[PDB]
Structure formats: structure tokens, C-alpha cells
Write a protein that binds this ligand. Structure first.
Ligand SMILES: *C[C@@](*)(O)[C@H](CCCNC(N)=[NH2+])NC(=O)[C@@H]1CCCN1C(=O)[C@H](N)Cc1ccccc1
Ligand SMILES: [K+]
Ligand code: NA
Lengths: 249, 26
DNA sequence: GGTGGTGGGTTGG
């Protein structure tokens, strides 16, 4: 998280960390959506240009963490991976199209105050909240700045930018399975996701029901917190069909 | 079923630092 | 330490 602040305990309890088994290292972020399910970004386990073909027993999942490293005794739950569902039509070559992947845990997790899932947007909430100029939270232990290593979970709130701006904000191909969010140069306010926040959720708290909704998934960008540059996230609802498909497995 | 309600914010009936900030945008 | 740098924390000795 670039130009953010330290997290309050359990303000993102659904925040999930992808850890690698050997060498023991962080990969990126994810999101607790179910009790046995976690949702991340596909480039975070499969990006051939970076020689990445991560298997089940290559990865851990650390839920309900706060300190980036030190093993929080009697707080964080470390889980195993049983199955990994990556989107078949994940266009990794061009523009991380359908940058999304799901994770079946060995068996379910018991919730604490530090572990608690986020809601998925329905047909209504998606249209209702995902208007440009509306604000949403992004979390992760990602870079503080592009090269940036925070000791604690980082938080930022950012407005959705409208499709036109994003379309030509970059020379990269933009789809509706993608949305851009962040700050205009003029806006004086700064903020953006950085490399390492990937798979982390773009959450929006609904005003009707005080429930939190993961609207996005930290996908990509060009640099970090740059002027005319906005963080790109995976459009959750425009994939809630495939999402539903593989949970009904 | 119980998602999106933080058992120390929504459940303890509490605001965070900047959920107010989020609300004010809508 | 195991997992930081201080006692508990947000969680034991
Ligand atoms: C894996 C994630 O940590 C990271 C997300 C970066 C988000 N931060 C910003 N700037 N909003 N993803 C990446 O780094 C992706 C994966 C592959 C390369 N990449 C990029 O963002 C490139 N800088 C640009 C890009 C290359 C290929 C396809 C799409 C974008
Ligand atoms: K200790
Ligand atoms: Na920006």
C-alpha cells in the first residue's frame, strides 16, 4: 500500500496472506470469502514470464495477521491448500485479463475476531456501489513505494475512476473484467496499491446493510502512486458466474 | 450469512478511523 | 526465542 497508514486490529479480518513454503517468503495477498475458500489474483501463482507455476504444497495461507512477519502466537491460523482453481481464460500474456483464482483449504477455518469473511456483491450492490467517484478500501502488506516494506498491514481508501480515464490512462488494453481506481494528479490526495498487495481486496462497506463487500482484486498497475496512474483491480461481479460455478463443485 | 461484519467493528458496534470517510463519499 | 523487542500485545512462558 502506497501513501497509506497502519491498520487497526481486525479492520480487515478477511485479509489473507499468501506465503511460500521454501524459501519461506510472502507472495501476495488474498481474501477470506468463505470458511474453506480464499480468493486471490492469478498472476500471484501463475505468471510464466516470471516462471511461476505454484502447486498446492508450495504455498501456505496465513489468516488474521497484522505484523507482516513475526508469528503472532495464538492469533493467526496457518492453513494448508487442498485445491487451486485458476480461471481457464486467464489472459496472462497481454493484460492480466480475468486475473483471478480461488483456493480450497484442506478443511475449514474457525473464525475469531481477527478471522472473519467478506461478502460478495449481488446483482444490485454491484451496480449500486460501483459508480465512479465512490470510495473503496484496499489492504495488503505490499510495497510502501515502488523500487517499501511495512512492518504492519497497510490500508488505503481510493475512489473509482471512470472507464474512459482508465482506458487511455494507459496504452494497455482495458476490459470490463477490470476496473481502475485511485487519484487524479490534481486531486492533491495520493494513494495506490503497489507490487505485493496483489490478490488483496478492494472492499466497499454497504450503507444499506453495514456489511463489507469485496468489489475488486489488486491486479496490476504501471509503477505505484503515480500521476495519471491508477491501480487496476479485477472486476469481481463480472465474474461471479465462474466464482459460483467452482464453489458448486 | 454473517460475512462483512467485523466482530469488533460492526458487531461491537464501532466505527473505524475512516469508514466515516467512505460513507461521506456516497 | 519460538516470532519482535520489550511483559504484554492482539497471545504463554
Ligand atoms: C502481483 C501484484 O503484486 C501486482 C499488483 C500491482 C498493483 N499495483 C499498482 N501499481 N496498482 N501485479 C503486477 O505487478 C502485475 C503482474 C505482472 C506485471 N504487473 C504489472 O503491474 C506490470 N507493471 C504491468 C503489466 C504487465 C503485464 C500485464 C498487465 C500489466
Ligand atoms: K513474546
Ligand atoms: Na495515483
Amino acid at each position: 500500500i502506497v501513501e497509506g497508514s497502519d491498520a487497526e486490529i481486525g479492520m480487515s479480518p478477511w485479509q489473507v496472506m499468501l506465503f511460500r513454503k521454501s524459501p519461506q517468503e510472502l507472495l501476495c495477498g488474498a481474501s477470506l470469502i468463505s470458511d474453506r475458500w480464499v480468493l486471490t489474483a492469478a498472476h500471484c501463482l501463475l505468471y510464466p514470464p516470471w516462471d511461476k507455476n505454484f502447486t498446492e504444497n508450495d504455498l501456505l495461507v496465513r489468516i488474521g495477521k497484522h505484523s507482516r512477519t513475526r508469528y503472532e502466537r495464538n492469533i493467526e491460523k496457518i492453513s494448508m491448500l487442498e485445491k487451486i482453481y485458476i480461471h481457464p481464460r486467464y489472459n496472462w500474456r497481454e493484460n492480466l485479463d480475468r486475473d483471478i483464482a480461488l483456493m480450497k483449504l484442506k478443511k475449514p477455518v474457525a473464525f475469531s475476531d481477527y478471522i472473519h469473511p467478506v461478502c460478495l456483491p449481488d446483482r444490485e450492490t454491484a451496480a449500486s456501489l460501483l459508480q465512479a467517484g465512490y470510495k473503496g478500501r484496499v489492504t495488503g502488506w505490499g510495497n510502501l513505494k515502488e523500487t517499501g516494506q511495512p512492518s504492519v498491514l497497510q490500508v488505503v481508501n481510493l475512489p473509482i475512476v471512470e472507464r474512459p480515464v482508465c482506458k487511455d490512462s494507459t496504452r494497455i488494453r482495458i476490459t470490463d473484467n477490470m476496473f481502475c481506481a485511485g487519484y487524479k494528479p490534481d486531486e492533491g490526495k495520493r494513494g495506490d496499491a503497489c507490487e505485493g498487495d496483489s490478490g488483496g481486496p478492494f472492499v466497499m462497506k454497504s450503507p444499506f446493510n453495514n456489511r463489507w463487500y469485496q468489489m475488486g482484486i489488486v491486479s496490476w498497475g504501471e509503477g505505484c502512486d503515480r500521476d495519471g496512474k491508477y491501480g487496476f483491480y479485477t472486476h469481481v461481479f463480472r465474474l461471479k458466474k465462474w466464482i459460483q460455478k467452482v464453489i458448486d463443485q | 450469512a454473517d460475512c462483512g461484519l467485523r466482530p469488533l467493528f460492526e458487531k461491537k458496534s464501532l466505527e473505524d478511523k475512516t469508514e466515516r470517510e467512505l460513507l461521506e463519499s456516497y
